């Protein structure tokens, strides 16, 4: 009735690092070798067929379909023995003796007059039948799920598995044996309705019948093995060529345990055992040491890593985990149910997750969050989910078909989605809230041959015999080709424009070399143990890394020599960060709770304090200066984490959402309301502000704006079949011509009158090299070095820009500090400028020389790094001006200057501007932007199309060639997405870094480092089809196409 | 040739778009089903009456390894060594036929 | 049908509409050196320093052999079983005597 014995969060990771070492179990000096590497193939169906092999070296079965050690899921066996009764052998090779009936080991048995049925924790059940000629042994006959889906097995004479048949009584697989080893499988074949055949895998055996070689349908060897006299494996070789060699030894227990492992790359490991005390030691060539201590049950109780971190565990009968204890004393505790189902977990902070299950099956009925909010589920008598209920009370409904496949979803507000499924378990037709279907088409092998959208456009795919993708193709005719090698360790991607990108790997599968279209070679270097050491750039400059015993990043060196050194606590968390300049240091210190979450940051600039909710969602923040004033922020979320209120020194921001999660409306500090009427996502979306209609959108069957109303005038859009914007018109005009790579190469502005046209030229890698205008009034040419450092024209057509330090370009000159930060800039338009930086690498003070002398501008930053105020002082500290900002989640919303207020309204959730509102009350005036494809504005129109402000730009940095305004006084500063012009210095702000439009580069390296790319000063390959609004949610520390810690 | 006269009877042919013979008829009947590699894998002889069908199985290299008839009155299986030397069935499923000298096959 | 080539990789591949791949590998002179069928059957060639074929090795392992004269004219050919053919050439690069020797009368 239970206790069926056998013989073999942060806590869930510590436990998994000690149970197994190197595939080598810790307590048992054995092997376990099962993963996707041994997953020979997989077939579609209501019940998938997964051919997963397993090797243990501890099972006692000397014979089988694949030899000693190896096992297959369909070799399950049941034996009946005298009481000193019933025994079950699983896929993993664990001998389970039940006896004469739920068990805590996740196994259920019940015997019927004619057969026996075993159900696991989930709905999968397996049915045995008596073995012909033997009443003391049983063999697998049927498999099934909670639904009616099932698999049958048909055996041959001599009791050898022959066929596997599906629920519809149709054969799928067939086994073929040999003559030398009739008990060993040789080939596996697949059957189609056409009575055809196709081989999937082949096996070759040694002189002892032990599996030695595996081959695919294409005859390419994938895996090799070798064996000792006792059938114990000593060598296994993967597909990439990597060879692992083992050794075995005999102990006083008359059981064989592994003692030594090595490879062809120099990696080595040595194991030592002391069974009296249950102690296991592991040693490496690097002199690293690991220690484990286990109990008589062969369960781990003590773990000691290379760093002397100590973990302890407590075990209960039936092999359940009760408690885990960390080096700091923090205790994780668990509590189960009578059936073994987990009920509660509690962590050192005392925040508990709880769940209440059912009785018929192991299904969760209620879930509880640490805050107390609960999720409710109610099921169908067959186990299928029928409805879900959230804390807010909003319900969701599902309908399940006969075979347990969902066919209709009803969400809140009555929105309905419907689906049709294939007999093999493959989706065919999907419908949205409206009648807009997307359909699929499948090939004989069961892959996605084609996809059909609402408009009827077809996309086609051509696969290999093994399913590996080769080509993708569109209706317009463009195609993409992929080149791969099973063992060649080479891959290639061919752009629709014909250009190829190559990748080369190593024996471990790690990327080693990349080659671009123009031969730019990027290389990587690895240690014997697989740890990255050097990353070598296109030009030759290399970044370097150095790792500690625990494989935690210790030191990072950039191109210029600037180094970062990290210090880790006893629980694998950083507490000290040191930045050393290239040939004084900067130190940041941290203080964190028992869990990983951060409380305090200390810098020479001051102190920062944080406060979270039990769900690890930030609720309060503070910064206190060094003997100075203090500022603070507060937040307030909803039951689902939705942010409802944000309170700061500026005031209060209030949001209200819909049941679908959309942002229905918002309230400003000035108490005005923004309302947005969603239909989930579709037509007749509207923006109303406080009662004044601003813009109403009419959308197409893909939910793309085809018409936009901007007052008394309307704007229309026309898109291509492939989905690219082709033309735009404005009548109460413009055309874009692209390339095969979707780059923008031509832009016509007039068709009804003398056409004005513009051109751009790109390299194969997207870098823009030239620019011309149809008026012939402009001409620009750009030259780039490898690694994308701009060059000063043909004067320096060839030459290395060291460390990506741009020193001169035309009349500009730059100077750089030891940390890579610009300090001095020299030009003619605005003279010489100097900059000063905070400890967090932020810009505070800019000094400029003017006819009035040395003017100054100082920037004020909030706790999170956002910009709130800017102040300009003339000489002798005489204030000239001040401007203040109001954000809305990393997106500018309002700005305020002397008796002036400006509100920005965007389109959708992007940074792209749509409308600008000036003044309050009767003084409110509404104006509309006319943006380009990149969001860069070109004219600002009142109603009736009056161009109040017009601009023309260069390609880079939207540097102004001409601007014109009449009586309108407010300045336009938006420029690119995320940017705001600072006329007092001429450098854009973005959100976290300043941008120099003269050279198209940032003035300081990326705070996050290599995550942003190899070049730390780069904005993008081209500013016409790329964006980088952040220049880098909430950032506790510190690109897109058209380790740092966060919340 | 779409039509051929053979005396008092006429014969008609129907070809696929790709150019492969698909069916043939003879009235004053037969159908071929191919594979993606254009190999012949099925041959039906009757459509107006009880259909009689035949099958063939090929390797990836085109070598024919099996043959079956819809009447179930015939069954043949062929095993080849590397270099395409016929083998005497499973009795010699593996082994080198030296110099392509075939010495025995069934009673020969 | 898909074709795979390398500008300097000296590897080529043809993918049948049925999905199966045939591979060819060349040498520094561009001469074919190895062929691999869909099922791994490997056919190999051997060349002399001067680019003259010497051996043609079959799928199983049996090899045909060749021997050339000063003028790069075929002199001797050996089959798998040892049967040899020897050619005699006149003063104007034309054959006048053909001798077939059985494996161990002509």
Author numbering:
A (entry chain A): 268 to 275, 289 to 302, 305 to 366, 371 to 386, 395 to 877, 891 to 1039, 1051 to 1350, 1408 to 1413, ...
B (entry chain B): 1012 to 1039, 1051 to 1130
C (entry chain B): 774 to 877, 891 to 892
Article excerpt on this structure:
The type VI secretion system (T6SS) is a widespread protein export apparatus found in Gram-negative bacteria. T6SSs mediate bacterial antagonism by facilitating the injection of toxic effector proteins into competing bacterial cells in a contact-dependent manner. Here, we present the structures of the T6SS effector RhsA from Pseudomonas protegens and its cognate T6SS spike protein, VgrG1, at 3.3 Å resolution. The rhsA operon contains genes encoding its cognate VgrG spike and Eag chaperone proteins, both of which are required for the delivery of this effector into susceptible competitors.
